[PDB]
């Protein structure tokens, strides 16, 4: 059984960038019922429980073929996810390690910024949209992605989280979703969190380069 | 030649560079010593490191998907074998409410092809039928009735090439379950950084945050946290329920993948150690692959680049 | 050059069923835009045209969700609610046993589409674009009423179906009135909404259609 | 080996189906597909739920050298992409519903 | 260039400069070979090797040197090449654990009481508690006020109660199945026999996440790093090639490491059940060769290719795309049982026919118990027949089946191309370079 998370920061702390009606009813039941209705299914199946949570994502995709848990299993996971991936305060420019790899893979972060909004506005119906770490190809990417898909299927490393269903953001842009990105992207995008996420990928990636003998 | 079948290793004197663009032969600047490093398909189950225990009158009639069977003179040539636009005759069939495409088509000229007999027979009573025909559906039995893989090109390591030489108290375990740290904003806690990464993800906020030293804290299901001391390294067993000490605080002779001549001596009462690399490191022995020198001078060229398959008898 | 057309009914006659600042916003600045980007791009002939048998060309979205939208509009009336009546009654009750059993498995469907998308009730009088798939034996209940839910802008149409009647289950249609609780919404469409007449009227275009093709 | 086949191909099974599943799948108003001694080599690119009612039917994937076991009243869903290849030693009838992504 | 060809030559084909530890003569033949084919040497190093050619030159120089051979000997085995830098592990905060049971238990086939299960149950919903530094300061219990006595560990007692009697009652049969099946003892493997202690901890006792105190028992240059954890079975870091050559400086044998369980799976398929990361020393900057899937047992019963990449998470077998639509494609109406219709059918009409009478070859053996002979007799002496009734009956069930299938699936691609989900199965058909009567 998996309980609800809270964000790390109080449901007003968003205001006037995402106001706390969005917060009471994207964590208080959208959120909360994701999270109610996977232990409901959890409770009957021994196998699919003590899965670790990405184990769970991934078995229950099968593979393309979805088994009935995995729409409650990921979204709950892309949630807690988006929640982190805001801070009161975000936006500005990142620093330190996320700055070199945004300028690296993408040519800087101009071009980054420009490529994440087509994702996001060319995002047909409800999905996400994500900046990750490929694992064979060790660059970040930006991939958009339908309902309640999310790359740890693919086997890559989110970084970054953006929710682009509607229900996240019509009662404060509503179908004005190309200013909604935008804003997220200047005053609520958590780069601070993409440090860590990024370090924690550093485990399984390795960005670096190899140290090699001259003999 | 190749003595044995094995990999090529070469350490230094051994030009990296191909001496032509296209080909797969180095040169030597200086006096040097190949090795071959001896070893013994489906590519979707055997991987690197695999341990592989096992080795590697129409009513009587009937028209079907590509084939249709005859109980009129029907031809049938001597070798059973139908051409495209032959003729083996010259109202066949039920004419079969529904009836699928088929590569085969009848004009009586069968165009689009073997022929057997079938005979079907019943207490004692024999007739035979003449038998044409040409995803799992288009499928035309019954349940009631060693070695290491080593790839990178697979090579097989087994015992023909591989052979081994040679509080309360303390105890190695689990520490507990490692939670998040929200100040962090990570699912899975670091607990760790490095002299790249911490230069590279280490937020302004989180500098006062980093210590030299392990610090264990301990929460219950209540959400109480216990310490038992903020300056040492105490931890709790879960098995046993006790707090104890860890072992550091956490502020051999033979190296792993060296290399061996077959005569070098290791001590006085030892037996010598024979040529090949330190593939495995323990407490008191060393598993060792073995590998064959070979001297090469100056101006010799090396047929092959690195880590390449040779079998025996190759140059 | 397609255009928008006004809904034949006054925005403020659908309260409380449908805000008059939900009708006016979903019509005009959702369906409008879809129009609008259709035309720059540039109904049943389109579509089908730009579905191009799956492979789906970059139109098919804005003139998909503006013939269903079309449709939607349709099919909700001030004085709708209850029960049809006549050759539809007898339809419904041989293809789903009881009305009751019917506005079940709809509300079950429409609660159930997960994601942005559409729930449709259609007649079967579809014909595949391969050999061998006409019966010359038909029993006269191969062309039955089924429930179908669609992603995003998929219409049953796209497989030679004949919609009658649908249920919008984007979150746009409802977020500013029902704001999460789906079950709520489609308790209210089905018991006020429901045009029974414009279902009529569709079924029996079906039904014409059928006949026309049968000779 | 150690795992069972349903568990590798992913075969759900409700075998002694209670019938409050039953009509709540409408079990009662599906088609009815019947066989005797045959073989039939399929391939299922959809899901597929099965009802048996009467007869037995032994399921080899391809490529397996063992099958699992269905007997009557039991309820299978077969999932896409399986490669298997059903078996009849008697008189077989079954109900179904070939379902699409989500729906049930 | 020779200095991007050694840099390929590493990174594409594991190239390191181990060293090459030779005896006199081999050293002597590299380094007289320098100079020329038989030419007085001159270079010192030269000289010095010819000198090394007798032992007693070696002795002599060993005790003007004033050492003991022993080391002398163990001088030999050093590294040589420059060293890589120290590491700095510090610590990403404090280190801050729970107590919380593996989601996983009970085993499979192990009965226990589920309300005590429920009991232990609610503990997993504990990670979605918050836990901020700035708070590990208003309740900090030091002393005799963290004794063991005042911990609030029920469902874990509960656990261990439960662990401790799943130990006991199957602690004997898994040393007999790992007899059974492993014929040899590896790291990775169930310790057994006279090396096996009581209060191993068993592969239940361990899941993800938790954080392990160990000692490295074993070196592997293909596999990685071996630490004991306290349990049957030794955990697994998989470190391989040419991160051996700078890694083989800080991970050595026998020294306490710290360690975080990053998987646990079943030891009949996979070789190494615990796979672990080290967190004490940090050495993840330097791994970069990485495993792409765990390395599996192939064990005698596995005859299916598709049942072992089912057991682990591995791709299917790939195969040449057929290019051709599986919608495009014409429905079937073939009904497999026709042809066993047909045998029937012809059975009995020529029953019928001898009874009428008498009042590459392939042979069909068919019996009589198994027709309706009365049934045929009366149509005979009434006069298409009834078994072409029954054909066309199962002809129109078999293609009705390919109708029903036909619209699921084009629902199906509709509903994918709305969602970008994949309409064939991932890992098979890959593309290329990987390897007239009716009118009559
Ligand atoms: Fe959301
Ligand atoms: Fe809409």
């Known amino acids: ?215 | 030649y190749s003595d044995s079948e094995g990999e090529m290793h070469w350490s230094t004197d051994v030009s990296h560079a191909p001496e032509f663009t296209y080909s797969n032969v180095h040169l030597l600047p200086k006096t040097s010593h190949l090795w071959i490093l001896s070893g013994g398909i489906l590519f979707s189950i055997h991987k690197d490191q695999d341990q592989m225990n096992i080795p590697f009158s129409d009513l009587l009639a009937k028209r079907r998907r590509n084939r249709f069977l005859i109980p009129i003179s029907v031809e049938i040539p001597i070798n059973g074998i139908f051409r495209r636009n032959s003729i083996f005759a010259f109202t066949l069939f039920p004419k079969d409410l529904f009836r699928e495409k088929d590569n085969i088509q009848l004009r009586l000229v069968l165009n689009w092809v073997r022929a057997f007999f079938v005979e079907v027979n019943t207490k004692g009573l024999i007739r035979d039928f003449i038998r044409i025909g040409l995803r799992k559906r288009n499928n035309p039995m019954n349940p009631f009735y060693h070695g290491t893989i080593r790839m990178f090109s697979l090579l097989i390591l087994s015992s023909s090439n591989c052979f081994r030489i040679g509080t309360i108290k303390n105890s190695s375990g689990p520490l507990g379950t490692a939670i998040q740290i929200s100040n962090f904003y990570s699912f899975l806690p670091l607990l760790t950084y490095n002299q790249i990464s911490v230069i590279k993800y280490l937020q302004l906020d989180n500098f006062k945050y980093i210590f030299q030293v392990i610090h264990s804290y301990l929460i219950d299901e209540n959400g109480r946290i216990f310490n038992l001391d903020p300056y040492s390294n105490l931890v709790l067993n879960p098995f046993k329920l006790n707090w104890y000490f860890l072992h550091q605080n956490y502020n051999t002779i033979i190296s792993l993948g060296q290399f061996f001549c077959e005569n070098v001596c290791i001590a006085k009462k030892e037996p010598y150690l024979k040529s090949g690399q330190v593939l495995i490191v323990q407490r008191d022995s060393v598993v060792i692959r073995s590998a064959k020198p070979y001297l090469a001078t100056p101006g010799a060229k090396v047929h092959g680049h690195y880590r390449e398959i040779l079998y025996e008898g190759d140059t | 050059g397609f255009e928008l057309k006004p809904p034949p009914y006054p925005l403020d006659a659908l309260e409380p069923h449908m805000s008059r600042e939900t009708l006016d916003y979903h019509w005009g600045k959702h369906h409008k835009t879809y129009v609008e980007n259709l035309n720059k791009q540039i109904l049943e002939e389109v579509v089908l045209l730009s579905y191009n048998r799956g492979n789906m060309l970059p139109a098919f979205n804005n003139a998909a969700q503006a013939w269903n939208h079309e449709f939607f509009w349709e099919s909700i009336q001030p004085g709708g609610g209850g029960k049809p009546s006549g050759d539809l009654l007898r339809l419904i009750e041989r293809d789903f046993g009881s009305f009751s059993d019917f506005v079940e498995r709809f509300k079950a469907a429409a609660a159930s589409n997960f994601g942005s998308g559409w729930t449709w009730l259609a007649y079967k009088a579809n014909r595949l674009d391969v050999a061998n798939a006409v019966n010359p034996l038909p029993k006269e209940e191969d062309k039955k009423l089924v429930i179908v839910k669609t992603p995003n802008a998929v219409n049953p149409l796209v497989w030679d179906y004949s919609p009658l009647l649908t249920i919008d289950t984007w979150e746009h249609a409802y977020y500013l009135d029902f704001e999460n609780r789906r079950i709520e919404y489609i308790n209210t469409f089905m018991e006020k909404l429901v045009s029974w007449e414009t279902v009529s009227t569709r079924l029996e275009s079906a039904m014409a259609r059928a006949a026309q093709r049968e000779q | 080996m150690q795992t069972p086949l349903e568990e590798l191909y992913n075969v759900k099974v409700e075998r002694k189906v209670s019938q409050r599943r039953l009509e709540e799948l409408g079990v009662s108003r599906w088609s009815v597909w019947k066989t005797g001694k045959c073989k039939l080599p399929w391939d299922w690119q959809v899901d597929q739920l099965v009802y048996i009612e009467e007869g037995e039917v032994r399921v080899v994937p391809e490529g397996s050298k063992r099958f699992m076991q269905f007997l009557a009243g039991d309820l299978v869903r077969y999932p896409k992409w399986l490669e298997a290849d059903l078996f009849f030693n008697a008189p077989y009838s079954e109900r179904y519903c070939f379902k699409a992504y989500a729906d049930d | 260039t020779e200095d991007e060809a050694r840099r390929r030559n590493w990174i594409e084909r594991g190239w390191a400069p181990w060293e090459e530890i030779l005896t006199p003569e081999a050293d002597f033949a590299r380094k007289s070979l320098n100079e020329g084919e038989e030419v007085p040497l001159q270079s010192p190093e030269a000289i010095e090797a010819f000198k090394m050619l007798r032992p007693s030159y070696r002795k002599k120089k060993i005790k003007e040197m004033g050492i003991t051979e022993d080391e002398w000997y163990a001088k030999q085995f050093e590294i040589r090449g420059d060293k890589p830098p120290p590491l700095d592990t510090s610590w990403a905060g404090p280190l801050v654990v729970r107590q919380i049971p593996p989601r996983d238990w009970p085993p499979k086939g192990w009965e226990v009481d589920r309300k005590e299960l429920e009991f232990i149950r609610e503990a997993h919903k504990l990670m979605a508690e918050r836990v901020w530094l700035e708070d590990l300061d208003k309740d900090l219990k030091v002393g005799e006020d963290a004794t063991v006595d005042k911990m609030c560990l029920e469902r874990f007692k509960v656990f261990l109660k439960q662990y401790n009697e799943w130990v006991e009652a199957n602690k004997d049969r898994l040393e007999e199945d790992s007899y059974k099946y492993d014929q040899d003892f590896y790291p990775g493997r169930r310790i057994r026999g006279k090396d096996y202690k009581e209060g191993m901890y068993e592969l239940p006792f361990y899941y993800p996440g938790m954080i392990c105190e160990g000692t490295v028992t074993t070196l592997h240059l293909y596999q990685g790093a071996f630490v004991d954890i306290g349990g049957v079975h030794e955990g697994w870091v998989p470190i391989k090639g040419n991160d051996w050559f700078w890694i083989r400086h800080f991970i050595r044998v026998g020294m306490h490491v710290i360690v975080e369980i990053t998987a646990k799976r079943d030891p009949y398929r996979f070789r190494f059940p615990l796979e672990l990361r080290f967190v004490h020393p940090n050495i993840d900057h330097m791994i970069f060769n990485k495993f792409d899937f765990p390395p599996i047992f192939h064990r005698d019963g596995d005859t299916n290719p598709d049942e072992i990449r089912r057991d682990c998470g591995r791709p299917p077998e790939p195969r040449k795309d057929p290019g051709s639509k599986p919608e495009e494609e014409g429905l079937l109406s073939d009904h497999p049982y026709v042809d066993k219709l047909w045998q029937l059918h012809v059975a009995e009409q020529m029953i019928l026919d001898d009874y009428e009478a008498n009042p590459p070859k392939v042979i069909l053996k068919t019996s009589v118990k198994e027709l309706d002979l009365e049934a045929a007799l009366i149509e005979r002496k009434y006069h298409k027949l009834r078994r072409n009734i029954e054909m066309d009956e199962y002809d129109s069930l078999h293609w009705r089946r390919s109708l029903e299938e036909r619209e699921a699936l084009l629902r199906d691609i509709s509903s994918r191309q709305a969602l970008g989900l994949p309409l064939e199965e991932p890992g098979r058909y890959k593309p290329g370079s990987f390897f007239s009567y009716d009118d009559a």
Do not use: C
Not at chain 1, 42 to 61: F, S
Not at chain 1, 115 to 139: M, Y
Not at chain 1, 153 to 161: A, L
């Open chain 1, 1 to 215: 059984y998996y309980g609800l998370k809270t964000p790390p920061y109080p449901l007003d702390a968003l205001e006037p960038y995402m106001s706390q009606r969005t917060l009471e009813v994207h964590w208080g039941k959208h959120h909360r019922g994701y999270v109610d209705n996977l232990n409901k299914q959890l409770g009957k199946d021994d196998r699919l429980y003590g899965y670790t949570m990405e184990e769970l994502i991934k078995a229950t995709y099968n593979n393309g073929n979805p088994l009935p848990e995995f729409n409650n299993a990921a979204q709950v996971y892309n949630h807690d996810f988006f929640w982190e991936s805001m801070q009161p305060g975000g936006g500005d420019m990142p620093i330190k390690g996320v700055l070199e790899q945004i300028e690296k893979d993408f040519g800087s972060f101009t071009n980054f910024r420009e490529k994440f909004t087509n994702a996001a506005l060319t995002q047909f119906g409800s999905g996400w949209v994500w900046l990750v770490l490929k694992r064979e190809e060790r660059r970040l990417e930006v991939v958009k992605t339908s309902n309640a898909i999310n790359p740890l299927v693919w086997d890559d490393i989110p970084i970054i989280n953006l929710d682009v269903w509607e229900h996240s953001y019509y009662l404060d842009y509503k179908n004005e979703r190309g200013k909604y990105i935008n804003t997220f992207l200047n005053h609520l995008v958590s780069w601070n969190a993409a440090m860590s996420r990024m370090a924690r990928a550093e485990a399984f990636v390795n960005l670096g380069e190899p140290t090699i003998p001259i003999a």
